[PDB]
Design a protein. Structure first.
Ligand SMILES: *[C@@H]1O[C@H](CO)[C@@H](O[C@@H]2O[C@H](CO)[C@@H](O)[C@H](O)[C@H]2NC(C)=O)[C@H](O)[C@H]1NC(C)=O
Ligand SMILES: *[C@@H]1O[C@H](CO)[C@@H](O)[C@H](O)[C@H]1NC(C)=O
Ligand SMILES: *[C@@H]1O[C@H](CO)[C@@H](O)[C@H](O)[C@H]1NC(C)=O
Ligand SMILES: *[C@@H]1O[C@H](CO)[C@@H](O)[C@H](O)[C@H]1NC(C)=O
Ligand SMILES: *[C@@H]1O[C@H](CO)[C@@H](O)[C@H](O)[C@H]1NC(C)=O
Ligand SMILES: *[C@@H]1O[C@H](CO)[C@@H](O)[C@H](O)[C@H]1NC(C)=O
Ligand SMILES: *[C@@H]1O[C@H](CO)[C@@H](O)[C@H](O)[C@H]1NC(C)=O
Lengths: 115, 49, 45, 43, 49
C-alpha cells in the first residue's frame, strides 16, 4: 500500500502527507524510508464565510476567502496562492439574509470587457 | 475544537468551528452551502444527542 | 494516548456557534479536573 | 559533577494558542523529510 | 485515523458517513463517541441515462 501507490490514511505511511516509500533489506526484517511533505511559516489573515453581490450569496469552491489588508482573495488551504476572485471561482446559492457574517463585495465578470 | 485535522501535520492551524463544518461536509460530497442555510438545526440536534 | 505533540490549554468559553462542549470539557469550579461524562463513566464499573 | 536524580516527568511543552472568531493561519512554505521504520519478518 | 482526520472507509469510524470522534478516558480502556450523518425521507422520481 505504500510502495505501489500513494496512501491516503493519516500516519499509515509516514508522519505527514505521504509521497513514496523505498524498501531496503535487513537481517530478519525490512526497513522502510518514507518521503513526506511538511508545511511551515503560517500567517494570520481575516476571513468571511461568504460574500454578497447583487443581493445574492456566492460560496467558494476549491478554496477559502482571505483578506490581506488591500482586497479579498481566495487561496488554497495548504499553500498561499492568492487569485483574483472571479465568477467561475464561485457558485451562487441561497440568499444573503439567511447567513451570518456575509460581506458586501464585487465579483469580476470576464465577459464585461468583451462587450 | 479549533485546529481540526490540521494539527496532525505541523504544530496546529487556527480556524473557526463553523468553517470546519463546511470542510467536513465537502468531504462527504454534500455541498458546503447545506450548512450555513440552516446552521441552527444542526446545532440543536447535536446538543440533544 | 501519548501521541499529542503539545498539550493546548482548555479555552475559556465553552460555546462555539451553538455547539455546547461544557459536558466534555472540564470546568474549574468542580474539585476534579475530570470531565462530566468521564466522571460518570468512572462511576459505573 | 554528575549524579543520579529522581524527578516528576514533564509530559510536554505546554503551549497556548489564542482563539479568534474570524482568523485563519495559512502556511507559506514547506519542507521534505525522510523517516525510517523497521519491522521483523523472520525467525 | 478517526480523531485526527476524516475517515473514508465504510463503518470504520461510526455507522454512517463520519464527521468526528472525541475520546473519553475510562478504567483499563477508552471510549469513543462518533458523530455520523444519516439521510432519510426518500422520494421516487423518473430518470434517463
Ligand atoms: C450548555 O449546557 C450546560 C449543561 O452542562 C448548561 O449549563 C447548565 O444550565 C442549566 C440551565 O440553567 C443550569 O441549571 C445548570 O446549573 C448549568 N450547569 C451545569 C448543568 O453544569 C449551559 O447553560 C449550556 N449553554 C448555554 C449557552 O446555555
Ligand atoms: C496573529 O496571531 C497573533 C497572536 O498569536 C495576534 O496578535 C495577531 O493579531 C494575529 N494576526 C492577525 C489577526 O492578523
Ligand atoms: C494584496 O494582494 C494584492 C494582489 O497581489 C497586492 O497588490 C496587495 O499589495 C496585497 N496587500 C498588501 C497589504 O500587500
Ligand atoms: C452592505 O452591508 C450592509 C450591512 O453590513 C447592509 O445593510 C447592506 O444592505 C449591504 N449592501 C449595500 C449595497 O449596502
Ligand atoms: C464573533 O463575531 C461577533 C460578531 O461581530 C463578535 O461580537 C464576537 O466578539 C466574535 N467572537 C466570538 C463570539 O468569540
Ligand atoms: C522557504 O524556505 C526556504 C528555506 O529552505 C527558502 O529558501 C525559501 O526562500 C522560502 N520560501 C519559498 C517560497 O520557498
Ligand atoms: C414509489 O414506489 C412505489 C412503490 O413503493 C410506486 O408505487 C410508485 O410508483 C413510486 N413512485 C414513482 C415511480 O414516482
Amino acid at each position: 500500500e505504500c510502495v505501489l501507490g500513494q496512501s491516503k490514511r493519516v500516519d499509515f505511511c509516514g508522519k505527514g502527507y505521504h509521497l513514496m516509500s523505498f524498501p531496503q533489506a535487513a537481517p530478519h526484517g525490512v526497513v522502510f524510508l518514507h518521503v513526506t511533505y511538511v508545511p511551515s511559516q503560517e500567517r494570520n489573515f481575516t476571513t468571511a464565510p461568504a460574500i454578497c453581490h447583487e443581493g445574492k450569496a456566492y460560496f467558494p469552491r476549491e478554496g477559502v476567502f482571505v483578506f490581506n489588508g488591500t482586497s479579498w482573495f481566495i487561496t488554497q488551504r495548504n499553500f498561499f496562492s492568492p487569485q483574483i476572485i472571479t465568477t467561475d471561482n464561485t457558485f451562487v446559492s441561497g440568499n444573503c439574509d439567511v447567513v451570518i457574517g456575509i460581506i458586501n463585495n464585487t465579483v469580476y465578470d470576464p465577459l464585461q470587457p468583451e462587450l | 475544537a479549533t485546529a481540526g485535522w490540521t494539527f496532525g501535520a505541523g504544530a496546529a492551524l487556527q480556524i473557526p468551528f463553523a468553517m470546519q463544518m463546511a470542510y467536513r461536509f465537502n468531504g462527504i460530497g454534500v455541498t458546503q452551502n447545506v450548512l450555513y442555510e440552516n446552521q441552527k438545526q444542526i446545532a440543536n440536534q447535536f446538543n440533544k444527542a | 494516548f501519548a501521541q499529542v505533540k503539545q498539550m493546548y490549554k482548555t479555552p475559556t468559553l465553552k460555546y462555539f456557534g451553538g455547539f455546547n462542549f461544557s459536558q466534555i470539557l472540564p470546568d474549574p469550579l468542580k474539585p476534579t479536573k475530570r470531565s462530566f461524562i468521564e466522571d460518570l463513566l468512572f462511576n459505573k464499573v | 559533577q554528575k549524579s543520579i536524580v529522581a524527578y516528576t516527568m514533564s509530559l510536554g511543552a505546554d503551549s497556548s494558542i489564542a482563539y479568534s472568531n474570524n482568523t485563519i493561519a495559512i502556511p507559506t512554505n514547506f519542507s521534505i523529510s525522510i523517516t525510517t521504520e523497521v519491522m521483523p519478518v523472520s525467525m
